[PDB]
Amino acid sequence: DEETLKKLIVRLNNGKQIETLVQILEDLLVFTYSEHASKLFQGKNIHVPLLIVLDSYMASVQQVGWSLLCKLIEVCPGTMQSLMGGVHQLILKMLTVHNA
């Protein structure tokens, strides 16, 4: 539950198994329970470095990561508020490093 969310934060605090942790995170993401992902630590701060460092050349994680990112921007209402005010530098990096 939420313990798995902070534990995934703790595992991802330190790429293949990272993709699996993010995958189970996406499995909780696509669920439609409640206002569950209201922590927004990842989604604003924890998701980003693995989104850029652990996806440098990657889309082993960059695919599922940016997918989870968009699903999270759709899910969490405060995700945009945590965004509106760097993700903008990050998305161009992911696009430029992946032309094909």
PDB file of C-alpha atoms in Angstrom:
ATOM      1  CA  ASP A   1       0.000   0.000   0.000  1.00  0.00           C
ATOM      2  CA  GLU A   2       1.499   3.302   1.114  1.00  0.00           C
ATOM      3  CA  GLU A   3       4.385   1.448   2.757  1.00  0.00           C
ATOM      4  CA  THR A   4       5.240   0.067  -0.670  1.00  0.00           C
ATOM      5  CA  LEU A   5       5.158   3.638  -1.989  1.00  0.00           C
ATOM      6  CA  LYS A   6       7.718   4.907   0.502  1.00  0.00           C
ATOM      7  CA  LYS A   7       9.684   1.685   0.110  1.00  0.00           C
ATOM      8  CA  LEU A   8       9.834   2.177  -3.644  1.00  0.00           C
ATOM      9  CA  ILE A   9      10.969   5.690  -2.783  1.00  0.00           C
ATOM     10  CA  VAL A  10      13.699   4.111  -0.619  1.00  0.00           C
ATOM     11  CA  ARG A  11      14.805   1.541  -3.203  1.00  0.00           C
ATOM     12  CA  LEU A  12      14.723   4.171  -5.937  1.00  0.00           C
ATOM     13  CA  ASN A  13      16.522   6.445  -3.492  1.00  0.00           C
ATOM     14  CA  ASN A  14      19.590   4.446  -4.565  1.00  0.00           C
ATOM     15  CA  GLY A  15      18.005   0.101 -14.207  1.00  0.00           C
ATOM     16  CA  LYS A  16      16.291  -3.193 -15.027  1.00  0.00           C
ATOM     17  CA  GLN A  17      14.943  -3.765 -11.520  1.00  0.00           C
ATOM     18  CA  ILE A  18      14.393  -0.003 -11.339  1.00  0.00           C
ATOM     19  CA  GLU A  19      12.052  -0.489 -14.287  1.00  0.00           C
ATOM     20  CA  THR A  20      10.276  -3.238 -12.339  1.00  0.00           C
ATOM     21  CA  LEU A  21       9.842  -1.023  -9.281  1.00  0.00           C
ATOM     22  CA  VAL A  22       8.516   1.716 -11.553  1.00  0.00           C
ATOM     23  CA  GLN A  23       6.298  -0.878 -13.229  1.00  0.00           C
ATOM     24  CA  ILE A  24       4.620  -1.885  -9.978  1.00  0.00           C
ATOM     25  CA  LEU A  25       4.352   1.846  -9.320  1.00  0.00           C
ATOM     26  CA  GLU A  26       2.545   2.181 -12.645  1.00  0.00           C
ATOM     27  CA  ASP A  27       0.285  -0.717 -11.661  1.00  0.00           C
ATOM     28  CA  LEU A  28      -0.764   1.178  -8.560  1.00  0.00           C
ATOM     29  CA  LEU A  29      -0.991   4.280 -10.761  1.00  0.00           C
ATOM     30  CA  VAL A  30      -3.479   2.899 -13.299  1.00  0.00           C
ATOM     31  CA  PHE A  31      -5.693   1.777 -10.420  1.00  0.00           C
ATOM     32  CA  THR A  32      -8.673   4.027  -9.695  1.00  0.00           C
ATOM     33  CA  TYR A  33      -8.990   3.805  -5.923  1.00  0.00           C
ATOM     34  CA  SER A  34      -8.884   7.219  -4.328  1.00  0.00           C
ATOM     35  CA  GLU A  35      -6.725  10.279  -3.738  1.00  0.00           C
ATOM     36  CA  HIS A  36      -3.847   7.865  -3.149  1.00  0.00           C
ATOM     37  CA  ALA A  37      -0.810   9.339  -4.937  1.00  0.00           C
ATOM     38  CA  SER A  38      -1.118  12.560  -2.932  1.00  0.00           C
ATOM     39  CA  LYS A  39       2.476  12.405  -1.683  1.00  0.00           C
ATOM     40  CA  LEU A  40       3.891  13.796  -4.964  1.00  0.00           C
ATOM     41  CA  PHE A  41       7.467  13.331  -3.725  1.00  0.00           C
ATOM     42  CA  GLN A  42       8.106  11.255  -6.746  1.00  0.00           C
ATOM     43  CA  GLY A  43       6.188  13.042  -9.428  1.00  0.00           C
ATOM     44  CA  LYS A  44       8.064  16.140  -8.387  1.00  0.00           C
ATOM     45  CA  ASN A  45      11.359  15.267  -6.683  1.00  0.00           C
ATOM     46  CA  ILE A  46      12.087  11.528  -6.469  1.00  0.00           C
ATOM     47  CA  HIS A  47      10.878  10.541  -9.920  1.00  0.00           C
ATOM     48  CA  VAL A  48      12.963  13.177 -11.691  1.00  0.00           C
ATOM     49  CA  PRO A  49      16.598  12.096 -11.035  1.00  0.00           C
ATOM     50  CA  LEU A  50      15.905   8.497 -11.972  1.00  0.00           C
ATOM     51  CA  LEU A  51      14.022  10.002 -14.903  1.00  0.00           C
ATOM     52  CA  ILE A  52      17.216  11.782 -15.996  1.00  0.00           C
ATOM     53  CA  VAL A  53      20.144   9.869 -14.494  1.00  0.00           C
ATOM     54  CA  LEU A  54      18.722   6.353 -14.638  1.00  0.00           C
ATOM     55  CA  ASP A  55      17.425   7.304 -18.093  1.00  0.00           C
ATOM     56  CA  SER A  56      20.486   8.862 -19.713  1.00  0.00           C
ATOM     57  CA  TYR A  57      20.528   6.558 -22.707  1.00  0.00           C
ATOM     58  CA  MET A  58      18.022   4.160 -21.063  1.00  0.00           C
ATOM     59  CA  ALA A  59      13.995   3.862 -22.976  1.00  0.00           C
ATOM     60  CA  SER A  60      14.289   0.835 -20.730  1.00  0.00           C
ATOM     61  CA  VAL A  61      12.905   3.098 -18.021  1.00  0.00           C
ATOM     62  CA  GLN A  62      12.377   6.340 -19.969  1.00  0.00           C
ATOM     63  CA  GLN A  63       9.414   4.780 -21.778  1.00  0.00           C
ATOM     64  CA  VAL A  64       7.676   3.481 -18.672  1.00  0.00           C
ATOM     65  CA  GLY A  65       8.929   6.468 -16.689  1.00  0.00           C
ATOM     66  CA  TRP A  66       7.495   9.188 -18.903  1.00  0.00           C
ATOM     67  CA  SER A  67       4.381   7.040 -19.278  1.00  0.00           C
ATOM     68  CA  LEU A  68       4.014   6.912 -15.508  1.00  0.00           C
ATOM     69  CA  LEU A  69       4.827  10.627 -15.519  1.00  0.00           C
ATOM     70  CA  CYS A  70       1.907  11.478 -17.792  1.00  0.00           C
ATOM     71  CA  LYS A  71      -0.371   9.059 -15.966  1.00  0.00           C
ATOM     72  CA  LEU A  72       0.689  10.809 -12.754  1.00  0.00           C
ATOM     73  CA  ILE A  73       0.059  14.278 -14.170  1.00  0.00           C
ATOM     74  CA  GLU A  74      -3.387  12.972 -15.054  1.00  0.00           C
ATOM     75  CA  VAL A  75      -3.838  11.305 -11.671  1.00  0.00           C
ATOM     76  CA  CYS A  76      -2.455  13.736  -9.122  1.00  0.00           C
ATOM     77  CA  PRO A  77      -4.185  17.145  -9.220  1.00  0.00           C
ATOM     78  CA  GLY A  78      -1.261  18.685  -7.375  1.00  0.00           C
ATOM     79  CA  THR A  79       1.197  17.224  -9.887  1.00  0.00           C
ATOM     80  CA  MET A  80       0.749  20.237 -12.156  1.00  0.00           C
ATOM     81  CA  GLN A  81       0.945  22.552  -9.144  1.00  0.00           C
ATOM     82  CA  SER A  82       4.226  20.874  -8.235  1.00  0.00           C
ATOM     83  CA  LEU A  83       5.206  21.267 -11.885  1.00  0.00           C
ATOM     84  CA  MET A  84       4.022  24.864 -12.418  1.00  0.00           C
ATOM     85  CA  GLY A  85       6.863  26.481 -10.514  1.00  0.00           C
ATOM     86  CA  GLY A  86      13.743  21.011 -14.269  1.00  0.00           C
ATOM     87  CA  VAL A  87      11.028  19.000 -16.003  1.00  0.00           C
ATOM     88  CA  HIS A  88      11.028  21.350 -18.996  1.00  0.00           C
ATOM     89  CA  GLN A  89      14.738  20.777 -19.529  1.00  0.00           C
ATOM     90  CA  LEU A  90      14.230  17.051 -18.948  1.00  0.00           C
ATOM     91  CA  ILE A  91      11.574  16.358 -21.575  1.00  0.00           C
ATOM     92  CA  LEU A  92      13.638  17.909 -24.358  1.00  0.00           C
ATOM     93  CA  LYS A  93      16.584  15.796 -23.240  1.00  0.00           C
ATOM     94  CA  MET A  94      14.450  12.678 -23.519  1.00  0.00           C
ATOM     95  CA  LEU A  95      13.186  13.754 -26.933  1.00  0.00           C
ATOM     96  CA  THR A  96      16.570  14.759 -28.322  1.00  0.00           C
ATOM     97  CA  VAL A  97      18.337  11.625 -27.113  1.00  0.00           C
ATOM     98  CA  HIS A  98      15.592   9.553 -28.776  1.00  0.00           C
ATOM     99  CA  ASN A  99      15.070  10.600 -32.374  1.00  0.00           C
ATOM    100  CA  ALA A 100      13.873   7.207 -33.657  1.00  0.00           C
TER     101      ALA A 100
END
